[PDB]
RNA sequence: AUGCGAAAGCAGUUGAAGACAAGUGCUUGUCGUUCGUUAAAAUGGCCU
């Protein structure tokens, strides 16, 4: 999707559907970024509670 | 210069015209201070980048690239520093949580 | 050299010296002198390769007929060209994507 | 395993193993360590006969080898060093830095 | 003097001065010894670290010992250490670098779960939270740094 | 798992072979950790493009 | 792309001459040429 964005910014401007596609993408990626973050917190407790 | 949106609009005007020197000043200021509590200037830089990349890349070749690389190195140390650091935050979190269990 | 070994086919830059046309192609008999021909690669080439990079106009491989009538050459873009010497006229053969 | 994560990087390492399968010699840059196979820790000297678990050397170690239960051979880019193991003293030094 | 300075310069420096030179060293020679010394006993090392001298001894000795030794050994040593000095030092830290944050990780390891002070710990919460926030901010700033139809045109020319 | 390791920390810090005994949790979380940085990369490029088209 | 370095990075680098082509003696280019330094195209794809 990185390379897709790199190629297709202007058609993204044009097309309406693609924009809401990227919106949904952004929602999911924020969500998983978060989940990974608290994942790292709990691995932190693993390191502590050794 | 305070609000992000007026920052965007005056930024568009700067692109109409100054842009190079404000770029360099923001770059140097941030590369001296990687830990400024203020975010306004970071918003300045992020907006100018996310609007006007290619022309800024093309304008110069030495005096912009060099300090870009230097601030790049400093921020590199920052992104190296982050992960275990938010781990530290989590540690303190669950220490407080254990303290809560002790209080009740 | 021809697969017989009886013929030599080579190129020289003297026409580059004496002309805008660069490369001179000469084929000769060895154990006798029955055959000896020479002609410019400029005449050989197409009328379109004059507006493209040195890649096209670069000769990259040579080969000879056993009877001194067909010659094969190959260039940097992978376009083989086969020349019949009598009328000195060509044919293009195109499969290799590289030289 | 034994997983230290030093905040430094050395591209040069070496390591060797005694035939017994118990004594392990990890030469990381500038310092060798003896480790027990069973514990992966420094071979503590309860007698304390100057058999210190670490050897800090003149230079960073690039090569380690053992010939027998007796003799360790370590090459630093300046020197070659042959050290006895029954008595913790360097037997031989050899100038290699110019080479 | 010049002789002892170049002895510090040269790598190998056998046993007894490495054992106890820090007490003697406690200026310019002190800097030279801390920036280059093959062997450094963790006792005196953490004592000098926790000294509030702070001529950037914090960063210096932190990077030194982190290049030098192992987190488990450090944790054992600073368990053997007291905790009042730990409190004062971390207070200086939260008042105001990857080395020092790694030391923060380490000291949390050493303290474990027992001795913590509520309000101090919450001050740590706020400090670390805002410093996190700015850190990921720095991250996206890095990554961003790393980043037909003329249906009818009412135009004119200058003939 | 958070509440679990919260409450019962003392006994497990008593029990020695924590790595092997807790194995799967270890590997799972380290995998997610390994994910983190490229995930950040994708996030930032996506913000770049999103602002690009939302500004107009 | 050089050196140094860790899988990061740090410094450094982009010179001339000759030649020839195109363009109006001049502008651009090119090199199966030199020394000097640490220096994207020819419709054209993989056997039984």
Swiss-Prot record, chain A:
<protein>
    <recommendedName>
        <fullName>U3 small nucleolar RNA-associated protein 15</fullName>
    </recommendedName>
</protein>
<comment type="function">
    <text>Involved in nucleolar processing of pre-18S ribosomal RNA. Required for optimal pre-ribosomal RNA transcription by RNA polymerase I together with a subset of U3 proteins required for transcription (t-UTPs).</text>
</comment>
<comment type="subunit">
    <text>Interacts with snoRNA U3. Interacts with MPP10. Component of the ribosomal small subunit (SSU) processome composed of at least 40 protein subunits and snoRNA U3. In the absence of snoRNA3, forms a complex with other t-UTPs. This complex can associate with pre-18S ribosomal RNAs.</text>
</comment>
From Swiss-Prot, chain C:
<comment type="function">
    <text>Involved in nucleolar processing of pre-18S ribosomal RNA. Required for optimal pre-ribosomal RNA transcription by RNA polymerase I together with a subset of U3 proteins required for transcription (t-UTPs).</text>
</comment>
<protein>
    <recommendedName>
        <fullName>NET1-associated nuclear protein 1</fullName>
    </recommendedName>
</protein>
<comment type="subunit">
    <text>Interacts with snoRNA U3. Interacts with MPP10. Component of the ribosomal small subunit (SSU) processome composed of at least 40 protein subunits and snoRNA U3. In the absence of snoRNA3, forms a complex with other t-UTPs. This complex can associate with pre-18S ribosomal RNAs.</text>
</comment>
From Swiss-Prot, chain E:
<protein>
    <recommendedName>
        <fullName>U3 small nucleolar RNA-associated protein 8</fullName>
    </recommendedName>
</protein>
<comment type="function">
    <text>Involved in nucleolar processing of pre-18S ribosomal RNA. Also has a role in nuclear tRNA export. It acts between the steps of tRNA maturation/aminoacylation and its subsequent translocation out of the nucleus. Required for optimal pre-ribosomal RNA transcription by RNA polymerase I together with a subset of U3 proteins required for transcription (t-UTPs).</text>
</comment>
<comment type="subunit">
    <text>Interacts with snoRNA U3. Interacts with MPP10 and UTP25. Component of the ribosomal small subunit (SSU) processome composed of at least 40 protein subunits and snoRNA U3. In the absence of snoRNA3, forms a complex with other t-UTPs. This complex can associate with pre-18S ribosomal RNAs.</text>
</comment>
Swiss-Prot record, chain F:
<comment type="subunit">
    <text>Interacts with snoRNA U3. Interacts with MPP10. Component of the ribosomal small subunit (SSU) processome composed of at least 40 protein subunits and snoRNA U3. In the absence of snoRNA3, forms a complex with other t-UTPs. This complex can associate with pre-18S ribosomal RNAs.</text>
</comment>
<comment type="function">
    <text>Involved in nucleolar processing of pre-18S ribosomal RNA. Required for optimal pre-ribosomal RNA transcription by RNA polymerase I together with a subset of U3 proteins required for transcription (t-UTPs).</text>
</comment>
<protein>
    <recommendedName>
        <fullName>U3 small nucleolar RNA-associated protein 5</fullName>
    </recommendedName>
</protein>
<comment type="similarity">
    <text>Belongs to the UTP5 family.</text>
</comment>
């Amino acid at each position: 999707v990185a390379v897709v964005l790199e190629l297709y910014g202007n058609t993204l401007e044009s097309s309406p559907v693609l924009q809401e596609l990227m919106i949904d993408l952004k929602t999911k990626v924020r969500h998983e970024i978060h989940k990974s973050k608290e994942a790292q917190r709990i691995e932190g407790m693993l390191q502590l509670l050794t | 210069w305070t609000e992000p949106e007026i920052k965007k609009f005056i930024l568009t005007k700067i692109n109409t015209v100054h842009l190079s020197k404000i770029f360099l000043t923001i770059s140097k200021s941030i590369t001296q201070n990687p830990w400024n509590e203020e975010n306004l200037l970071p918003l300045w830089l992020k907006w100018l980048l996310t609007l006007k990349s290619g022309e800024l890349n093309s304008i110069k070749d030495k005096h912009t690239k060099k300090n870009c690389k230097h601030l790049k190195s400093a921020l590199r140390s920052s992104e190296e520093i982050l992960p275990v650091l938010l781990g530290i935050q989590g540690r303190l979190e669950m220490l407080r949580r254990q303290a809560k269990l002790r209080e009740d | 050299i021809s697969s017989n070994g009886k013929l030599l086919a080579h190129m020289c830059k003297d026409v580059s010296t004496k002309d805008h046309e660069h490369k001179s192609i000469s084929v000769v008999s060895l154990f006798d002198d029955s055959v000896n021909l020479s002609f410019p690669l400029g005449s050989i080439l197409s009328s379109q390769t004059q507006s493209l990079s040195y890649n096209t106009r670069y000769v990259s491989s040579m080969a000879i007929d056993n009877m001194g009538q067909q010659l094969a050459v190959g260039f940097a873009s992978g376009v083989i060209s086969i020349v019949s010497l009598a009328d000195l006229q060509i044919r293009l053969l195109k499969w290799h994507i590289d030289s | 395993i034994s997983l230290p994560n030093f905040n430094h990087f050395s591209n040069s390492v070496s390591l060797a193993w005694s035939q017994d399968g118990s004594l392990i010699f990890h030469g990381f840059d500038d310092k060798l360590q003896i480790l027990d196979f069973d514990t992966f820790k420094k071979f503590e000297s309860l007698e304390n006969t100057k058999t210190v678990s670490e050897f800090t050397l003149d230079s960073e170690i690039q090569t380690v080898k053992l010939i027998n239960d007796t003799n360790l051979i370590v090459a630093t880019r300046t020197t070659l060093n042959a050290i006895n193991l029954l008595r913790g003293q360097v037997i031989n030094s050899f100038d290699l830095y110019p080479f | 003097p010049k002789t002892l300075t170049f002895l510090l310069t040269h790598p190998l420096f056998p046993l007894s001065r490495t054992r106890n030179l820090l007490s003697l060293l406690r200026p310019r020679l002190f800097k030279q010894a801390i920036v280059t010394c093959p062997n450094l006993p963790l006792n005196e090392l953490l004592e000098e670290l926790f000294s509030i001298r702070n001529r950037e001894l914090l960063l210096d000795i932190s990077f030194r010992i982190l290049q030098d030794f192992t987190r488990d050994s450090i944790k054992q040593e600073m368990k053997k250490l007291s905790k009042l000095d730990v409190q004062n030092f971390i207070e200086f830290i939260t008042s105001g670098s990857t080395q020092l944050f790694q030391l923060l990780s380490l000291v949390l390891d050493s303290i474990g779960l027992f001795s913590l002070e509520g309000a101090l710990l919450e001050n740590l919460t706020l400090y670390i939270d805002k410093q996190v926030e700015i850190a990921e901010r720095n991250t996206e700033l890095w990554n961003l740094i790393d980043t037909a139809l003329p249906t009818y045109t009412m135009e004119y020319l200058d003939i | 798992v958070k509440w679990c390791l919260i409450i019962h920390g003392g006994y497990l810090v008593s029990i020695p072979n924590l790595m092997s005994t807790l194995s799967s949790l270890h590997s799972t979380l380290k995998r997610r950790s390994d994910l983190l940085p490229r995930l950040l990369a994708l996030d930032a490029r996506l913000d770049c493009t999103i602002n690009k088209f939302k500004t107009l």
